[PDB]
Curated annotation (Swiss-Prot), chains A, B:
PANTHER family: FLAVIN REDUCTASE (PTHR30466), FMN REDUCTASE (NADH) RUTF (PTHR30466:SF1). This is NADH:FAD oxidoreductase. Homodimer. The chlorophenol-4-monooxygenase is composed of an oxygenase component TftD and a reductase component TftC. The lineage of its organism: Bacteria, Pseudomonadati, Pseudomonadota, Betaproteobacteria, Burkholderiales. It is an enzyme of class 1 (oxidoreductase). One of its GO terms (biological process) is pyrimidine nucleobase catabolic process. SMART domains: Flavin_Reduct (SM00903).
Amino acid sequence: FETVASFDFRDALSKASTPVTVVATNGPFGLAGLTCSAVCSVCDRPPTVLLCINRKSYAAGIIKSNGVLSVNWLAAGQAVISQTFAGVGSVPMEERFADKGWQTIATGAPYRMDAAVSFDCTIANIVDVGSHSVIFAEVVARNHAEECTPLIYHRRQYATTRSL
Amino acid sequence: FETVASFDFRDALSKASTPVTVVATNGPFGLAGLTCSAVCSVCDRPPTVLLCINRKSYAAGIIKSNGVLSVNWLAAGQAVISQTFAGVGSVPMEERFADKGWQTIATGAPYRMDAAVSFDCTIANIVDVGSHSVIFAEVVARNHAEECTPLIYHRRQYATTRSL
């Protein structure tokens, strides 16, 4: 078979929805983060998630060398955090972590303590596919804001949930 | 670092949200599909998605031996399809596909033509991690439905999107 056009693929993907996360890191190689909507759980033993990020980015470089990271599922009121970590407004990488919402838990990675879900993680394995590194990360601590709804991305806009 | 208890990881995941998909297949090993809350896009060249499914599923071995599959992101009105493919009502596998909204496109996998998004795919790589197979699949065709609001799963309930 021939694969669809990359343009067609991206067009279609805009019709699917995703949660919005920020992946962050800190350690000997420094502080960095980016928004990532290609994230999912893998298995519960050992508890493992994966995230797919383009290897060309500033943050990918620092995440992979620090070897630890957080995955932070953002809550409905946090679209501005997603924008900043997606490069909207071009906030310099190290100025992105100003507020008190970011704290360490176990690994030294910054964890967003008011995110719907924050997992603090160690990198266990990496599979490269096309432009992206698929990073498998084992969860060594968790945190949750008080109940709240998710930030969702769909058709190139932010949204949150409602019952059917 | 020690990993979190598996019970803690599962509890945390219920507070994240995911799109609801059905992964389906057909071929020499027969028809099968199942609901899947762990899917994401990987890279656009070649256009690749991944999905993680428990190796103990009846469907998982058939999907991997057939070598082809579809990923169908369900729309807000399709909770009954999700229910059926999560095994509610114990509907026999072949009968799940009797409805004419299920069609082939390119590979022979059943594609849900009215799903918000349906990708028809060939398996390219399988990585087994803990209890699950992480299946990398390249997209060879898609189906384009009209303006489809998502079916989302969050805190053990179905949901759809609203604006912020």
